[PDB]
Symmetry: C6
Subunit: 166 residues, 6 copies
Amino acid sequence: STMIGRILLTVVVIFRILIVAIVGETVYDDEQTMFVCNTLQPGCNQACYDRAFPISHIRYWVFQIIMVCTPSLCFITYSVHQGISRFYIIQVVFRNALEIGFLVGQYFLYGFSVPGLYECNRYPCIKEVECYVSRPTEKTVFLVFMFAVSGICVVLNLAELNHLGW
Amino acid sequence: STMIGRILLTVVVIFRILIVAIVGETVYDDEQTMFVCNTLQPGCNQACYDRAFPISHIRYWVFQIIMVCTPSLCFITYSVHQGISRFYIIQVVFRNALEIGFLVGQYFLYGFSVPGLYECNRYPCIKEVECYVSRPTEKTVFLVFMFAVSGICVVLNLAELNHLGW
Amino acid sequence: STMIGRILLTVVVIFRILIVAIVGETVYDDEQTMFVCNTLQPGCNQACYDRAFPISHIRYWVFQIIMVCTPSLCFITYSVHQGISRFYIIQVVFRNALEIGFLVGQYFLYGFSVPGLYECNRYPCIKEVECYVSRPTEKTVFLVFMFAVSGICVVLNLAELNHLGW
Amino acid sequence: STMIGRILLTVVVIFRILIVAIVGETVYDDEQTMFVCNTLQPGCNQACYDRAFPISHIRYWVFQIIMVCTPSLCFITYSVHQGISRFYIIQVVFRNALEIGFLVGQYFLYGFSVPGLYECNRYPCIKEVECYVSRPTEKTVFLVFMFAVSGICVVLNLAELNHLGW
Amino acid sequence: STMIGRILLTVVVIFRILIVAIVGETVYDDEQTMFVCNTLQPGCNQACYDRAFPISHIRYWVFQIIMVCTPSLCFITYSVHQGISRFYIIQVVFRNALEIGFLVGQYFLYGFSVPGLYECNRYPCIKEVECYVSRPTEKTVFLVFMFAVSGICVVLNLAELNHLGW
Amino acid sequence: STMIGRILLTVVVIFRILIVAIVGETVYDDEQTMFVCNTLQPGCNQACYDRAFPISHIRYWVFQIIMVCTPSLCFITYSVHQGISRFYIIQVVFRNALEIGFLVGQYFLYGFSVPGLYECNRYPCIKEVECYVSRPTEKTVFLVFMFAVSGICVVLNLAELNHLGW
C-alpha cells in the first residue's frame, strides 16, 4: 500500500484533465443566451446572471488544475538546474493544502446542486423578478463527479503524507 | 480463435474513437436552438428540453470511451515503473464489468429510438404542452450503430475470458 | 499495366480524402437555418427537413472512407504481431464488396441530383406544403464527382482481382 | 535561363497556397447572410443566390490547387516503389494541359469583375426583382491576383517545355 | 536567496501565459452583443462602448507578454550568431523598466474594478443616457489577479538587480 | 553598428508576425454586423461599407508579410541546390523597394486615423445618408503601431545598404 497510490493518483489526475478539456468547454457555451427573465426592463438579465453565477465553474476548475501542478514544475526546474528530500516534503505539504482549500471553496461558493429557478431583486430589476436557467442537470452531474475525484485525490495524498512523514 | 480476437478488438476500438471524434460533435450542435415548443410562456422550452434530454448522448459516450481504457493506462505506468499476470486478470475483469454496465445503462436511459414529439407537463408550462425535435433519424442511426459496436466488444471480451478462465 | 494500378489507387484515395476534409464541411453548415417552408405552424420545417435529408451526404461519405480502410489496418496489426497471402486475398475480396455496396447504396438513397423544391405532407404540416432548399448546384456537383471517383476505384479493384484470380 | 525557372515556379506555387489558405476562408463567410433581395416572397433569396454564384470561387481554386499536384505525387510514389524520362515528360505535358484548362474555365465561368447588383427572374421570384451583394471589391481584387499568378505559371511551364522539346 | 529566484520567475511567467491563453479569450467574446443601452437612436451603443472600453484588457496583456520577452530573444540570437555580461545587465535593466511601465499603465487606464453602469453623453446619444455592462465580476477578479502576478515579478526583478548592482 | 542591425531586424519581424497572427484576427470579426446606417432602404449598408473599407487592413498586412519574405525563400532554394553575392545584393534591393512601396501605399489608402462617422451618397442610398462604425479606437492604435514598425525596418535596411553599397 505504498506503490499503487502513485499510479492511482497520476491516473485520476489525467482522467480529470481529459474530462475537463474534452467536454466542459461546450456545456457552458449557451449560459447567457438562453438565460431569460420575465420582464421588459433593459438590464435585468445581465444583472441577475452576474449575481447568480459570478465565477463560472469551468474556469474555477482550470485554475485549480493549474495551481495544483506548480510544485512539480518547480521540482523539474530545480532538478534541471542542478537539500533535496526537503523539497519533496515541502511540495507534498503544499499540494495537500491546495487540494483541501480548493475543495472547501468549491463547497462554499456553488454547493451540491443547480436549480432551475432564481429570484433576483437587483437594480434595475423591479422587486423580486423570476429568472430561468439552462442545462441544470448536466451541471449538477459534473459538479458531483469533480467533487468525488477531488476527494479521492485528497485521501491518497493524506495516506501518502502519513506513511512518509513523522 | 485465440489470436485474431485481439486484432478485431483493437480495430473496433479505434473505429469507434474515430467515428465519435470526427462525426458526432456537429450533429448535436443545434439541439437547443431548433427545439421549439407551442406556447408563449418564457421558461417552457428550457424545462421541457432538460426533462427530455438530461444527459446528451455524446458526452455519455466520451465518458464511456475514457473510463474503459483506464486499466491499460494503469498497466502502462506500472510497467514503466519496474505479481504481473494477476494484473492482467484483474484488469480484464474490470474491463468486462465496465463494458457491460455501460451497455445496460445505455439501454435504460435513452432506449432504441428518438421520436419527433414530446409532451411535457413541467412548471411553468400549462397542462400538457407539446414540443418538437430536430434531426431524430440520424440520432436513431447513431444509437443503433454504437449499440452494435459495444455488443461486439462484449462478445469478444467474454470469449477471451472463457478461453483463459477457470 | 500491372504495377501502376497501385499508384492510381493510392493517389485516388488520398485525392478523395483531401477533397472531403478540406471542402465538404462548410457547404453543409447552413443546411437547416436557410431551409424555409411556407407556413406559420411551429414544427413543419424540422419535419420536412428530416424527411427530405435523413442522413447528410458528408457523414455517409466519412463512414464510407473509414469502413473501407479497415482491412489495411488489420493487415498492419497482424503483421506487427508476427497463412499470409490468404490474408491478402480475403482483404481484397472484402474491399471490393464494401466499395460496391457503398456505391449502390449511394445511388439508392440520394440519387443523381438535388432539386430546389420539396413537397411535404407530414404532421403537423397541413396538407402538402412547399419547402425550399439551399445551395443545390454545389451539392449536385459534389455528388457526381464522388460517384465518378468511386467508380474508378471499383474498376481498378476489379482489374486487380481478375489479374490475380482463377 | 534554365535553372531559375524552377525556383520561381515553386515559389509562386507556395505563395499561392499560402495566400489562399490564410485569407480566402473568411472573405466568403458572410456570402449568404448578407445577400438580400427586395421582396417578401419566401424562396427568392436562395434561388437568386444559387443562380448568381453556383460554384463559389474558393472551392474552384482549392480543386485547382489539388489537381495540379497529382503528377508530382505519382512521380514521388513511383520513385519510392522502385523510364524516368518518359514519366517526367508525360507529367509535364499533363501539368501544362491542366493549368491551361483551369485558366480558361476561370475566365468562362466568373469573368473579370463582380458587380453590386443582380437581377433574377426565377421561380418563385415574381418578374425581374433586384438583389444586392456583399464585399464585391475584395473579390474582384482576389480574382485578378489569382489570374495573374496562374498566367505566370503557364508562361514558365511553356518556356520549360520549349527548352526541352523536340 | 540567490538561486530560487530563477525558478519562481520562470514559473510565474509560464503560469501567467497559460492562464491568459486558456481562459481569457471567451470571457470577452460577448462584450459588444450584450452591451445594451436605453434608447432608440441608431449609433449610441457603439459610441458608448468605444468610450467605455477603448482597449480590451486582453489585448493589453498579450502585448505586455510579448514585449517583455524580447530581450531574451535578442540574447538567444546574439548567442547563436557567435562584451557578454554587459548584455545580461542591459537586458535586465530593460526588463525591469518595461514591467514597471506596464504595471503603472494598467493602473492608469482601467483601474481596480469594473462597474455595472456607465453614463455616456457622446454624440448621437441625447443627454447622458445609461448603459449596462456584462460579466463585471469575472473581469474584476482577472484584473486583480494579473495585478498581483505583475507585482510579484517586479519584486523579484528588483531583488535580483540589487543582489548584482553597485 | 554593423552586427546588431540583423538581430533588431529579425526580432521586429517576428514581433510583427506574432502581433498580427495572435490578436488582429478578432478585432475585425464584427465589422459588418455592427456597421449600421440610418435608413430603411435594403442595400445601403452593404454599399456604404464597401465604399468605406474596400480592402480591409489585416489582409493588406498579411499580403505585405508574405510578399516581403519571398527573396529569402528564393535564396534558401538556390542555396539548397549546391554568382552568389550578386544574389544577396539583388535580394536586398528588392526587399527595400517592396517595404517602401507598401509603406507608401498604407499611407495613401487608409491614412492615420479611423473616424466614427461616414457620409455616403451611393446608390440606392437616397441623398447623403449617415453611417456609423465599430471599434474606432483600437484600429487607430493598430495602424500607428504597424506604421512605426515598418518605419524601423525601412531605416535598418537603408543603413545596411549604405554600409554595404557604392
